[PDB]
Design a protein around this ligand. Structure first.
Ligand code: BPI
Ligand code: CL
Ligand code: CL
Ligand code: NA
Ligand code: NA
Length: 325
DNA sequence: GTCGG
DNA sequence: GCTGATGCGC
DNA sequence: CCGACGGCGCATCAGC
């Protein structure tokens, strides 16, 4: 962290400006990738040339590293930071529901701070109001211990609605992470499959609101719910912060590919999709399909467990804790 | 911005 | 009223 | 040189 923190902080700040102000999503991802690869580099970079050897670090970022190393700053970043409009646009996007487009619109009309947002509710859609309401809570991380308590509530209420449901809390949490940014829940039911009900998800969301676990709804459809939840506070104890929770309803026959996919990590999934193709298989979020000699993907293969997927590509079943790569 | 056909 | 496009989060 | 860069569900907008 102390090794190249200056560089990675610089790249990430540049990343945010590209996304939020210039609306250049590809440059945003480029800078992030450069920041990541450098974040892992087990040596203190002495020059851009050294950094350029890393995949994702090109000529431009090399030049920027040289400037930073010799001056401790980046002229363009110092300048953009002092820019009233750009810094405000960049800031507003921290509100969930306010993307680069809305942030630009707001700033163009003189709305530049949370306080300005607070006095202009009529100009915010439902999602943005909630994002504003929980601005601070949403930026806080979730200790694993709270995630465990959160899980207890979800599995219990899901089972209470129908004991045939199958719920799995995925994300880094499933891999054993010490803290999470949110709670991602994958849900299925035997009556729901690819080729075969709107209330399956609704009934669960409803029960979670009944025991006051879910406090707000950002979006809700027949297959995906996105909202806010909160653990009940202990006697005379301080209130827990509101948290982001997503609940996905997935066809049973696609459930395990979903759990695998949503457990990650991202690097693991890529390494698995690669090995999958090597054995003549195509693995995506939904299914695993056989690849013909001419490259034509056949029908979806039977999946009844996470392991089943590993068997197809002849790989040793790895537990989420070891799925970091 | 970086990579690679 | 509807259909497709856009913004957004992830 | 120049296109790719996992996109998918839902809310809301743009346009008929
Ligand atoms: C993929 C990608 C990114 C960011 C978030 C995100 C979250 C979920 C899914 C699901 C399916 C496809 C893509 C994603 C992503 C980006 O950072 C990345 O450049 C890709 O677009
Ligand atoms: Cl200006
Ligand atoms: Cl498919
Ligand atoms: Na490089
Ligand atoms: Na935002």
């Amino acid at each position: 962290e102390t090794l190249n923190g200056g560089i990675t902080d610089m790249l990430t700040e540049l990343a945010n400006f590209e996304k939020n102000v210039s609306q250049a999503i590809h440059k945003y991802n480029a800078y992030r990738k450069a920041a990541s690869v450098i974040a892992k580099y087990p040596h203190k970079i002495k020059s851009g040339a050294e950094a350029k050897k890393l995949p994702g670090v090109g000529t431009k970022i090399a030049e920027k590293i040289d400037e930073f190393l010799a001056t401790g700053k980046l002229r363009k970043l110092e300048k953009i930071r002092q820019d009233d409009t750009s810094s405000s646009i960049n800031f507003l996007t921290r509100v969930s529901g306010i993307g680069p487009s809305a942030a630009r619109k707001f700033v163009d009309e003189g709305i530049k701070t949370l306080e300005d947002l607070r006095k202009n509710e009529d100009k915010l859609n439902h999602h943005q109001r909630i994002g504003l309401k929980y601005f601070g809570d949403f930026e806080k991380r979730i200790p694993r211990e709270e995630m465990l308590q959160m899980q207890d509530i979800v599995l219990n209420e899901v089972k209470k609605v129908d004991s045939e449901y199958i719920a799995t809390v995925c994300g880094s949490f499933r891999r054993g992470a010490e803290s999470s940014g949110d709670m991602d829940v994958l849900l299925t039911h035997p009556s729901f499959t690819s080729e075969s009900q709107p209330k399956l998800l609704h009934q669960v969301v409803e029960q979670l609101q009944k025991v006051h676990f879910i406090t707000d709804t950002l979006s809700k459809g027949e297959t995906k719910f996105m909202g806010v939840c909160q653990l009940p506070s202990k006697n005379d104890e301080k209130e827990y912060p509101h948290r982001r929770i997503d609940i996905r309803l997935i066809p049973k026959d696609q459930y395990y590919c979903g759990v695998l996919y949503f457990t990650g990590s991202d690097i693991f999934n890529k390494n698995m999709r690669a090995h999958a193709l090597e054995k003549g298989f195509t693995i995506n979020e939904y299914t695993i399909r056989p690849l013909g000699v001419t490259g034509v993907a056949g029908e979806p293969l039977p999946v009844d467990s996470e392991k089943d997927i590993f068997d197809y590509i002849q790989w040793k079943y790895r537990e989420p804790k070891d799925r970091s790569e």
